[PDB]
Design a protein around this ligand. Structure first.
Ligand code: HEM
Lengths: 499, 499, 499, 499
């Protein structure tokens, strides 16, 4: 006998006891007489159109694939619940935080960023950690990563950043020139690049890394008072990372290391968990913060803004069918219930649009009707209708226009968003020159120790060495801006690689 | 007060009892606070991306439409049941005919042919009369028309025929030159054209016309014996047609005449019904038939092949949501349960491919998972997986390959198709001259009387007059081939027009 | 010999002189030996999968249709040019207005609003009048209507308004209750309703109606100075409308009356033209205008803001293939070149998102690559890549990320948008009660005369009579709010109708 | 200076030197002022819907991905020419073989089979080797592999086979139970499995392997005479394979080894070539062949059917944009010009349908209009029209129905397919027992030597050891049927593995 993941089929068979196998049918439900031999004219004659068993099956096979996620294509999913352990109702009226002991079902998907569906799990890259809470007030999607920050601070640079991390448009090869030219030209990336090339760049599976909302969000209480916050979900299994050596080995040995690690852990009752915390910053404090409180390349020092306990995230259920439950999972940062709102963070603002948008393309206009994406703990009632692949009853014969005099769904003023005053010109304000080095300096010499600083520089050099010399120079200049030694150590390694 | 159709909303509100209106939500289930005013900075300021209530709703509105059916786009639907009244098990082992009194739920869609979704119901055109039987052996789709024959006998001419009946590729206008150039060049169309321009060309609604499978089909019994057949479902409401004058009036007064007529008939309890019959031809008989038994431009004389009663079709339920239940309805001639099979009819053979093919395009790869199309009376089990908008559980974790040693779905030898012998070279046999006038002559001279013939010729000439003279001549020549008087009567009217 | 439209094919043939017919091929370019007879085993045998001539052609036929436009589905198109006749460079720096005599190619599509693709042209409804200018600074899409105003003033009510003007979700029938319940609940619609039910509700074809941008826009000159404007393009053919009786008759005699009239006019050299004017309002004046200058239900009095001539629009070319050049035509209000920008108009703001969004759905992600939609007079260069149906070279091997050090495209500061100042809270400001009667009263009493008011009320009553009494009462109540007589005249007709 | 592939951007910049960078525009051609900072109200304010530069770019990014190929997803492409070297016009009248020295442009795509888009190039798996010939008689697609045979002989087993080779439905992990359960239950796979697990299972890049049509095809000469044939294209750069150890290290060091190798070879002028040969078998010989001459699990012995030289395939041009020219490449086995036809091979018959079908889904209905897929050396002219993303002029105003009296395209009888006679009942003939070992014995004992035979068993055991014992037993049983020592050697290693 072997690991549970390996015995997937064996277990499916034994669980079907002595039940006779079902009758094999066409998509239309017609029993099939023989699905192993095609309908031909004579033993060695041509195939007939009349063989609709063949066409029915082949036509479906021909349409099995859907486009992969534009980013975070390689991933793993699991399900479980969220449980409130502490009272934060003074900050947010969100039903999900309603009362201690309150449980809400959740869906989670882990993933890498740049690699396609067939890529390896154990590679250096940020890690997606999206959590879907099916609440009474609809779904709340906390689409986070294994890092509290990111490489850029304005959504207009996202497509270009992703492109630079992907393949060359002509050769279809990973291109260090594209990678470092972009990062060297955009030093705001220094903070996350430092995180990326540290030990945390390659977590050991998905159970040994933390999750972060990254962005500054807004919480609103029952009295309509608002504060800004940040979400943190620390792994209860402890932080564990893979060495560059073992990561590379597993890259070919088991491209799906993260997938099987998670499935087996849950299958054996070793359910992984995370503790959800929040940091709170009042509007007054946000106006005095030394940097842009809504700058995604910045963190909120824990000493000034301590973590507040909220609850626990537990994954105790594996998907039964990956494609249906994980490949089709759709997380939308715009999916926020009353009590939780976005901040003016330029990046988050862009994500408000991008996710539902790419989902309408990747899955389809009615992707929210796919079981895993349905807010099944809520009652979806509105004036939206039709669209391709419309399931259910399309809200039946209910009046489809609002307002109406026929008792159809009514909006609820209780759900109105919190109001903030803004004053300024409609312009494209430059954020390229906000502080790009201060917090990186503290990360380098305060957060990391001597051994991980050495590893950090070797990891960077090992990749930067493949870029052109003028790019290497520019990149080293930025690192030096953070700290002379940071750049010096990298430069020293580059001179070696450069023979 | 008013007719049931007009009081649709009034009724929905009443059936709603005095319930409180549901809370209006986004597609994600999030309650909306005010869905009548957009989120802006200041009363006369710009719209925010932050307004996700707006985007959610507008994006779905922007995707409401799907491609209309390439043909038969304008239609009406209803639901009911098929009840067996006679025993024909000696001919077919199909479970649908299993025992007297057995009822099978059905779905039916009526339609015109050439017009697009916004066209009028009361126009001269054949009428679609598709019936979906949800049987224990899967769905059986009998996709018939209100005529036992058709204009052509080879599917390769179908796209061209339809193009000729639709809009000119440049002007987007109906084109009599296209219509008659095609018909005059393909005389095999004379039989259906005669029927089309007779009074039956414009039935009074959908309840006063007969239905026909048109094609010759094959029935197989428990002993594996087979016979050919024709399906006939006669209106119990009686044949009734609209005069050209009334149809033209209704065309603008109520372009949805047929839709309204059917909804109200059912809503008032005046359920329309049809009596299903079959004609049976043994294989020996098919070998001696004066024409090709599988030629779609010909009928089987009732005198030589008497109608055998089978059961009744009753429509007693209106759709609740038209888009979900009627617009998305998909009938596939290839959906046939054991006991019912196709004949060599070249046209039918082409249809075996065409419908599932167009449905995967118009609806989606997984169109059979749409509620109204699901064979909900059968257990769908096979090795098909994934595809866009994959609902349910995608068959969970069941082994997905066949054969397998894990108890997944299995054949069913009894379902094997009836084996027939065919001999001959594989080539394109010309069927253009398979007698295009004999049966047309009997229709013109015996089926119709004097006043009917006069109207028939007046209807033809009224439309053919707009074609070029050379086309008029070629058309008249064909009619003359059916009968000299047929031609001269039309010619005399044409001369009066060409004045 | 008939009209040009009727002789479309006749002319195509004559055009090919003695030139020999092309060889008929498959989509893959393989010559076809016989496209009239399918490949079978014996003259009365089954169809073979081997007949790839059949499958290739049928598979395409099965995919001919695309989703029709969610609104304005029924239309006609033509091409021509825009010629500058006056200098307005003091207001806008747009290249399209660069110098007197400058010509810019244009594409125009006329249409109704509610009817689907098969509906009739001569029905009461607003008329779409979209103009695409292919300028050196990209495409400028002025998506106007034949009216200066609209039914609503906030985009959140648009889907609802459209739903109310379309078919009942259960019966699929036009619904007077839906139409009037919505309008009676939203009095802001009074202005456009009065316009819609006046003689201008049914123009005589597309050449005898004016065009308007409707919304207030912003013009920016070379010195960075800005002013608000309104676009007006008056028909040089004169205003001409159809009587209700003639329109009803044509509804069935020629559903494509508008299409035919436009094609023949151009084919005979009787090219239609419109004179383009603009109204100008300074930011100072906008500050004290009696109404919200960005309220789409309001017009700017010509007495206070006279029309300033700009140029002429002339249509002198008929499309060659309707599907490729008209059905696939896509206009995005967001397509605005430097010198032209949007105003705060909530409705216009919503349209900035909706059109490109619906186009990605209806046509495809790369719909801007469809020839008629390509900004062929500009050099498209950016960092966008891939997507389905990617044509041309997909920008070859050019660096695909910005910024870069490899000489790829650069943004141009001179194209920066004009900066406007805004201040206020972020909230949903109610605009439901922004004076819904003042201008309506002026229209009713001044713009119209006794004869015109008589028909107006008869037209309204003729439709409103089919709504429930409680809806009729509320509707009449709003009309009385405009003017007592407006409501009483309608009420008198209603009483007669209700018996 | 590095390899050409690495200097892709460097070179693009240089070859553009002496040119000012282009203006960065939106998709609509509107120049952008600042594509690096989003439009907000105030420096730290909300993102505006008015930022259409952002929406236009992000919306396109959100739609960059299309479904990957259902199989053969990971690949590399290149272009070149086919040059005739010998005269085979006695066998085929195809224009592509017309005269010695004649050149026809070609497009080629190499690939693995099971892995997704992000998978490694150097893994054990068959290799795709598809060639598209742009001939004057349309495109001819020779969709070959690097092996002359395949695992199964009936298309109905293909989807199951591919499913067994891919990921487990629930775990999403490679599953040896699925792999070997299928192969052990279907011993016809022994021949190809033996080839797969031999040294040829992991080619050193794409230049050091052969290509085969695999299937028996049919050639028809100018006199209407036909013969059956096999296509063979041998590498001119010699057969070379990767050791299991080196392929494994390359899997993580360079997962795109094959792409890189091909691009650099061509970039440096080391153009790879292959010699195209054919084997000929007369209809008489096919009647007495010791096996089914159309059985894909069989080869035609060279001794009895020697290879006849035809021409050379030379690749001398790299793609300029991978996505447009390679990812979108579509090869349809059904694309065959006059002189080349299919054989009764059950697998080929199925492929005639599957490729165009999957292409309509993966790429779109009009995928043949994508530049790289267009039969640009031919003249496409037919009666097909419209469909989404319709490019070109959609054949303008040409009559769209056939037959017609207006001089539109006509079929050419000389292109009629060769006629063949087939006798026997039309039914599903079992082919599961068509000698599964005879040629496998020859391969094992005669083709391979002791060393490679040793590695063969080690390779099989290394993978088979992960399957359940009952599956191992059945698998070994099959190998023993080929030759007791074959199964014996594997069982020995298996025992050591099972420890
Ligand atoms: C009944 C058997 C088979 C079926 C139904 C089948 C089906 C498919 C499908 C659906 C694709 C994806 C096409 C695309 O998306 O572009 C594909 C690709 C491919 N198949 Fe098959 N296949 C079969 C057998 C084979 C055989 C025997 C060969 C070789 C002689 C072969 C060689 C290939 C190649 C090379 C490609 C990749 C083409 C490219 O590079 O785009 N297939 N096959």
């Amino acid at each position: 006998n072997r690991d549970p993941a390996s015995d997937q089929m064996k277990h499916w068979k034994e669980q079907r006891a002595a039940q006779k196998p079902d009758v094999l049918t066409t998509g239309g439900g017609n029993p099939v007489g023989d699905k192993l031999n095609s309908l031909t004219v004579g033993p060695r004659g041509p195939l007939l159109v009349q063989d609709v068993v063949f066409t029915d099956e082949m036509a479906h096979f021909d349409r099995e694939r859907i486009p992969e996620r534009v980013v975070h294509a390689k991933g793993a999913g699991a399900f479980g619940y969220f449980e409130v352990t502490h009272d934060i109702t003074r900050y947010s009226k969100a039903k999900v935080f309603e009362h201690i002991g309150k449980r809400t079902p959740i869906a989670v998907r882990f993933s890498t960023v740049a690699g396609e569906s067939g890529s390896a799990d154990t590679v250096r890259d940020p890690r997606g950690f999206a959590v879907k809470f099916y609440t009474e007030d609809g779904n709340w999607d906390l689409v986070g990563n294994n890092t509290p920050i990111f490489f850029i601070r304005d959504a207009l640079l996202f497509p270009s950043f992703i492109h630079s991390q992907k393949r060359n448009p002509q050769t279809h090869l990973k291109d260090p020139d594209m990678v470092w030219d972009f990062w060297s030209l955009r030093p705001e990336s220094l903070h996350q690049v430092s995180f990326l090339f540290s030990d945390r760049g390659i977590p050991d599976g998905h159970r040994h890394m933390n999750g972060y909302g990254s962005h500054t969000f807004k919480l609103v209480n029952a009295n309509g008072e608002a504060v800004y916050c940040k979400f943190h979900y620390k792994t209860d299994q402890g932080i564990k990372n893979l060495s560059v050596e073992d990561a590379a080995r597993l890259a070919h040995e088991d491209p799906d290391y993260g997938l099987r690690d998670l499935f087996n852990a849950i299958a054996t009752g070793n359910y992984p968990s995370w503790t959800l915390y929040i940091q709170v910053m009042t509007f007054s404090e946000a106006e005095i913060f030394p940097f842009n409180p809504f700058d995604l390349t910045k963190v909120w020092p824990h000493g000034d803004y301590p973590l507040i306990p909220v609850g626990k995230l537990v994954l105790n259920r594996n998907p039964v069918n990956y494609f249906a439950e994980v490949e089709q999972l759709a997380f939308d940062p715009s999916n926020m219930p009353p009590g939780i709102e976005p901040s003016p963070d330029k990046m988050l603002q862009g994500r408000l649009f991008a996710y539902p948008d790419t989902h309408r393309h990747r899955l389809g206009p009615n992707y929210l009707q796919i079981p895993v994406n349905c807010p099944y703990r809520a009652r979806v009632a509105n004036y939206q209708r039709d669209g391709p692949m419309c399931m259910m009853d399309n809200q039946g014969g209910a009046p489809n226009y609002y307002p109406n005099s026929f008792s159809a769904p009514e909006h609820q003023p209780s759900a109105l968003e919190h109001r903030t005053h803004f004053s300024g010109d409609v312009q494209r304000f430059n954020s390229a020159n906000d502080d790009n080095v201060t917090q990186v300096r503290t990360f380098y010499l305060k957060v990391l120790n001597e051994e991980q600083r050495k590893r950090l520089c070797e990891n960077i050099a090992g990749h930067l060495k493949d870029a052109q010399l003028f790019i290497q120079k520019k990149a080293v200049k930025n690192f030096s801006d953070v700290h002379p030694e940071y750049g010096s150590r990298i430069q020293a390694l580059l001179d070696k690689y450069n023979e």
